């Protein structure tokens, strides 16, 4: 079979401000096959209320999904997205970097 590893971006919907409610996003793209596990983490811990877009794909047939959750940033909370896919030996963790 063909196997393509996902690219990952983690980011907020709006410019991030403490005390101001927002959406944490994890966009996963360029992967094949379609089955994939994606979690949003708050201080290392899996967030339970996570929604995702309907599966679609690019012209090269690779899949993409947006996973997202409402959140209010604070100074001290750290956020990440953990992805596992057939092409990955260990789950991949990408931290949300709000200074970017």
């Amino acid at each position: 079979m063909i196997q393509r590893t996902p690219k990952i971006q983690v980011y907020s919907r709006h410019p991030a401000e403490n005390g101001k409610s927002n959406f944490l996003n994890c966009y996963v793209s360029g992967f094949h096959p379609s089955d994939i596990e994606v979690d949003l983490l708050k201080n290392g811990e899996r967030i339970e209320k996570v929604e995702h877009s309907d599966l679609s794909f690019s012209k090269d047939w690779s899949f993409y999904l947006l996973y997202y959750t409402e959140f209010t940033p604070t100074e001290k909370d750290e956020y990440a997205c953990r992805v596992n896919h057939v092409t990955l030996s260990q789950p991949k963790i990408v931290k949300w970097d709000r200074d970017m």
Partner: protein
Amino acid sequence: GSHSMRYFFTSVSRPGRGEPRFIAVGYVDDTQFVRFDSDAASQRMEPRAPWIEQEGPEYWDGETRKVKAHSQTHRVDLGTLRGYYNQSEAGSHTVQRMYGCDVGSDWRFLRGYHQYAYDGKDYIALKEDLRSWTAADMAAQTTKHKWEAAHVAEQLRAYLEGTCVEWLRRYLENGKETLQRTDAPKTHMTHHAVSDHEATLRCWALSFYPAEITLTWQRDGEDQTQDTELVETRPAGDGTFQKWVAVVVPSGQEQRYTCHVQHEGLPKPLTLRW
């Protein structure tokens, strides 16, 4: 400018028990307007844009019927293709289908397409003239002969030049307030330092629609590609898109570098500086 209607369909077989997972999504330009998910409770085609909710019960019944017909063809195809490629029942497999039409600024037919893939590889696609087929391999060639005898291309060409275009125009009119609106990117620049020699400049575009955009860096008025990093355009989640491009530069030389942004929502390209 130009517009499109595109449908995307994925089915994934489930070896041990029951039918495949089937997901269908419909877009006008970069806006999703409908969905069907075989794992959802409703078993109906569902609205995903408010302007499609204008459509009556007959629309929903007829789109539901068709999307389930799409689902059953895909189910049959997975077994047929397993047979063509002498594969076992144990493994999971995928079929993906995309079709739709492009119209120009005059909203007249420009382009139609219908392509199909098995396990993420080109299987068969309608050619640009919509009169013939591109078959990647001998399995696909068997399908091509089947579809030629059945005059499949002729039925598709009529849809792609007729109904597809007609209903795109209809959706564009009903969704005018958003679909015909451009949202210009909101731009800014950030600065970070790695050491006392080296700086990172990041040029951001936020909150734009449609997805199409060009961001580039120049150095002293000439295009700079080396030591740059450009991310994939990404959905904000509210219907708009985001992108950035970064350049690494020697500290103190920031002023040589300009970011240039091209988008249909901007009458002329915009320039940013640190």
